Amino acid sequence: GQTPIFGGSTGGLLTKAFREEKYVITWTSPKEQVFEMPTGGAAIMRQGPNKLELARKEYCIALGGQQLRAKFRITDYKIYRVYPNGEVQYLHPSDGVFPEKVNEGRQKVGYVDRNIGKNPDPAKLKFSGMTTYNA
Amino acid sequence: SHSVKIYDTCIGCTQCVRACPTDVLEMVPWDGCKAGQIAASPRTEDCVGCKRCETACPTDFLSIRVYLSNAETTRSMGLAY
Amino acid sequence: MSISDTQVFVALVIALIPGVLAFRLATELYK
Amino acid sequence: PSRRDPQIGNLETPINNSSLVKWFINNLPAYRPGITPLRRGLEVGMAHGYWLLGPFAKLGPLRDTDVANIAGLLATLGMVVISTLAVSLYAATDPPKPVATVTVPNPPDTFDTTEGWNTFASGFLIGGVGGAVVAYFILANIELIQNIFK
Amino acid sequence: PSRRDPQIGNLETPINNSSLVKWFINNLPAYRPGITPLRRGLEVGMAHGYWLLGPFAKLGPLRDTDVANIAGLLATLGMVVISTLAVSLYAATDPPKPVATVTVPNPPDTFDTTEGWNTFASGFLIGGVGGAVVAYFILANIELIQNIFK
Amino acid sequence: MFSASFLPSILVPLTGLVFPAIAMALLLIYVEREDPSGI
Ligand SMILES: CC1=C(/C=C/C(C)=C/C=C/C(C)=C/C=C/C=C(C)/C=C/C=C(C)/C=C/C2=C(C)CCCC2(C)C)C(C)(C)CCC1
Ligand SMILES: CC1=C(/C=C/C(C)=C/C=C/C(C)=C/C=C/C=C(C)/C=C/C=C(C)/C=C/C2=C(C)CCCC2(C)C)C(C)(C)CCC1
Numbered sequence: 001g002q003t004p005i006f007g008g009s010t011g012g013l014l015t016k017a018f019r020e021e022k023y024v025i026t027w028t029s030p031k032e033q034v035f036e037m038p039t040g041g042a043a044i045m046r047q048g049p050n051k052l053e054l055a056r057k058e059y060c061i062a063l064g065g066q067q068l069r070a071k072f073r074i075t076d077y078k079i080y081r082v083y084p085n086g087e088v089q090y091l092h093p094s095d096g097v098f099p100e101k102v103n104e105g106r107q108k109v110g111y112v113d114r115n116i117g118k119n120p121d122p123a124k125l126k127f128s129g130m131t132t133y134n135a
Numbered sequence: 136s137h138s139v140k141i142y143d144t145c146i147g148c149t150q151c152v153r154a155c156p157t158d159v160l161e162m163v164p165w166d167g168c169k170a171g172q173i174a175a176s177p178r179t180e181d182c183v184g185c186k187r188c189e190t191a192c193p194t195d196f197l198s199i200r201v202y203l204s205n206a207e208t209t210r211s212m213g214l215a216y
Numbered sequence: 217m218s219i220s221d222t223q224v225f226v227a228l229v230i231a232l233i234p235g236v237l238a239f240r241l242a243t244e245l246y247k
Numbered sequence: 248p249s250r251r252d253p254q255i256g257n258l259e260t261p262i263n264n265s266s267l268v269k270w271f272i273n274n275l276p277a278y279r280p281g282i283t284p285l286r287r288g289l290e291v292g293m294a295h296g297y298w299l300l301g302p303f304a305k306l307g308p309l310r311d312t313d314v315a316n317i318a319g320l321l322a323t324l325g326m327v328v329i330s331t332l333a334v335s336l337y338a339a340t341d342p343p344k345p346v347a348t349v350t351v352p353n354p355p356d357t358f359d360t361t362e363g364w365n366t367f368a369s370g371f372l373i374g375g376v377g378g379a380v381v382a383y384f385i386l387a388n389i390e391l392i393q394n395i396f397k
Numbered sequence: 398p399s400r401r402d403p404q405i406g407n408l409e410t411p412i413n414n415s416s417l418v419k420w421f422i423n424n425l426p427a428y429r430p431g432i433t434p435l436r437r438g439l440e441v442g443m444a445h446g447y448w449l450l451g452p453f454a455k456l457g458p459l460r461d462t463d464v465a466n467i468a469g470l471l472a473t474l475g476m477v478v479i480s481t482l483a484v485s486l487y488a489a490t491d492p493p494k495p496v497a498t499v500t501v502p503n504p505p506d507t508f509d510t511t512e513g514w515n516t517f518a519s520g521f522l523i524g525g526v527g528g529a530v531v532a533y534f535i536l537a538n539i540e541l542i543q544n545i546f547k
Numbered sequence: 548m549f550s551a552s553f554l555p556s557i558l559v560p561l562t563g564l565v566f567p568a569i570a571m572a573l574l575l576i577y578v579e580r581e582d583p584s585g586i
């Protein structure tokens with residue numbers, strides 16, 4: 001249970017972010033330095049645990065991408081989605097450091113490996129509601 | 136949300152996967168070219184319409200496209216309220 | 217010359233034939 | 248020192264958490280407990296229909312004519328009627344997210360329900376008419392102070 | 398195609414099962430849900446006491462005298478009073494077969510109970526008086542349109 | 548005026564005001580209807 005030293009703001013959690021969804025992020029920072037938050041604010045972190053609560057799936061990933069690993073090199077942060085019931089989802093990290101290309105075999109659902117020169121057509125595909133993929 | 140469209144011209148530089156801030160891509164194992172792992176969209180439901188991804192695609196006639204649908208929601212519209 | 221209660225008459229021809237005829241021709245297509 | 252977390256989009260400025268203001272806001276008929284929605288409607292109607300007739304009483308296009316009192320009366324009558332209409336239909340279509348945004352430390356009351364809203368609208372109608380007539384009576388005898396002449 | 402059996406003594410004629418009519422009959426204050434018996438009484442009183450004063454207002458034996466307005470008012474006052482008396486005593490002796498004959502697809506409401514009937518009668522009384530006075534006010538200034546002269 | 552009756556005096560307001568009122572009220576309550584029925 002560690003949260004950074006801040007003086008309060010006016011752009012935090014809203015009537016949706018506790019009736020629909022919650023976002024949380026946490027890592028291990030063995031140092032304390034000043035940082036910037038996307039809702040605006042220049043504050044200091046603390047040793048080890050660094051827990052933070054937020055509402056968007058953009059502030060969190062911005063912190064994770066640009067701030068932690070590109071500046072502070074910290075790479076042990078969980079990002080957690082939360083349902084209204086209080087239960088949590090673990091989307092990412094799913095590959096350790098989010099490299100997004102390394103694995104020994106990967107998932108397989110859906111494929112389209114075809115060029116565009118032979119495209120779907122209006123008058124040929126009709127009287128139904130399928131999309132540009134099924135040939 | 137919106138629909139994603141993949142092609143064969145993926146060289147495999149993987150600049151798009153490092154550009155999309157919405158976690159809708161992954162390089163699934165391929166065989167054809169030297170890539171061996173081609174990009175694809177497993178998690179479309181978080182698509183945003185920023186399409187910063189193909190701007191990161193260097194391939195001639197960039198290998199990814201996004202067909203911008205019509206079934207938008209609070210997730211696809213991206214509201215904090 | 218001009219008219220009388222006969223205009224209440226020409227009003228009376230409406231609201232049964234044209235009125236509910238148009239009403240049905242509207243509600244046919246499942247609001 | 249925020250309400251529950253200093254990172255939430257709220258601030259402890261001494262205008263939304265001053266003891267004076269919280270006492271003054273809690274005991275309003277919109278929140279003060281120990282009453283029925285009926286009385287709430289009655290009182291709100293009383294107040295509003297008691298002040299919402301001057302703004303056009305001597306201001307209407309009939310401002311200086313010798314009748315404008317009852318003119319403003321009829322005007323505010325229609326006004327409160329259509330206001331009741333509005334709130335009633337709002338209740339009719341009311342129940343997506345059947346809540347009200349809460350910032351007062353406690354929930355306001357069980358006033359938050361459809362039939363509650365309907366009864367509230369009825370009491371609003373009654374109290375509004377009442378405030379209207381009583382203001383019209385206060386204003387009726389222009390000599391209301393001239394007889395006193397004080 | 399009868400309601401449940403073509404041999405029952407009921408028919409599917411397009412006057413008792415037309416969508417227009419069923420929508421128009423369901424939402425009446427006698428059946429529309431989401432309300433209290435109180436409001437039901439209020440509204441029925443409002444309506445009836447608002448129209449049940451003309452039928453003798455200019456029709457009574459004092460038809461053309463210069464007072465007949467308040468005369469009709471007093472008449473309809475006594476009328477609604479005795480009507481409330483009647484319904485109240487009916488409630489007093491009410492509970493053999495404590496139901497109402499149901500033909501609307503659903504049961505109407507839990508309005509079918511003694512104390513419910515009593516509260517309904519009270520609301521009827523209030524709304525009837527109200528409709529009476531408001532109609533008397535509409536009719537008070539014979540010049541109600543003459544001031545408009547439109 | 549002419550040989551007709553008062554009618555052009557007062558038949559505009561209800562068409563001008565109250566019929567639009569019920570129109571939009573019914574319309575609004577229509578655009579919020581439940582499933583799968585609606586009138
Ligand atoms: C009985 C009587 C009376 C009364 C009457 C009346 C009052 C009438 C009414 C009238 C009316 C009541 C009329 C109306 C008209 C109608 C019309 C004119 C309609 C039309 C419509 C239409 C044309 C529509 C169209 C459409 C649309 C718009 C949309 C879509 C759908 C459709 C297409 C359908 C009197 C007293 C006089 C006399 C004695 C007896
Ligand atoms: C609380 C309160 C209140 C309030 C109430 C409420 C909240 C209500 C509101 C409500 C409202 C105020 C509403 C309104 C609405 C609106 C509307 C409803 C609109 C209209 C629309 C239209 C007009 C339509 C259109 C259309 C369509 C849709 C289709 C086609 C056709 C047309 C185009 C026509 C009061 C003041 C009383 C008092 C105090 C307390």
Ligand SMILES: CC1=C(/C=C/C(C)=C/C=C/C(C)=C/C=C/C=C(C)/C=C/C=C(C)/C=C/C2=C(C)CCCC2(C)C)C(C)(C)CCC1
Pocket residue numbers: 293294297373374375376377378381
């Ligand atoms: C100062 C001030 C203010 C203001 C306030 C005011 C000024 C208030 C008012 C006061 C008052 C002083 C008023 C009120 C009054 C009211 C009244 C007084 C009413 C009454 C009415 C009634 C109660 C009615 C009843 C009835 C009915 C409902 C029905 C039948 C008939 C009868 C009549 C029984 C403020 C807030 C800004 C704050 C600052 C300071």
Ligand SMILES: CC1=C(/C=C/C(C)=C/C=C/C(C)=C/C=C/C=C(C)/C=C/C=C(C)/C=C/C2=C(C)CCCC2(C)C)C(C)(C)CCC1
Pocket residue numbers: 480481483484487
């Ligand atoms: C719903 C309603 C209503 C109704 C109500 C009711 C339902 C009521 C009923 C009531 C009734 C319907 C009653 C009746 C009664 C009657 C009577 C009760 C009669 C009398 C009798 C007699 C007179 C007796 C005889 C005798 C004997 C038995 C013994 C010996 C001696 C002598 C001979 C005396 C109203 C309109 C209000 C309003 C609206 C709603």
Ligand code: SF4
Pocket residue numbers: 144145146147148149150151152173174191192193194197198199
């Ligand atoms: S689409 Fe672009 S970034 Fe993605 S694998 Fe192909 S070449 Fe690399």
Ligand code: SF4
Pocket residue numbers: 139154155156157158159181182183184185186187188189201
């Ligand atoms: S807009 Fe482009 S980068 Fe963003 S989620 Fe959709 S495909 Fe990915």
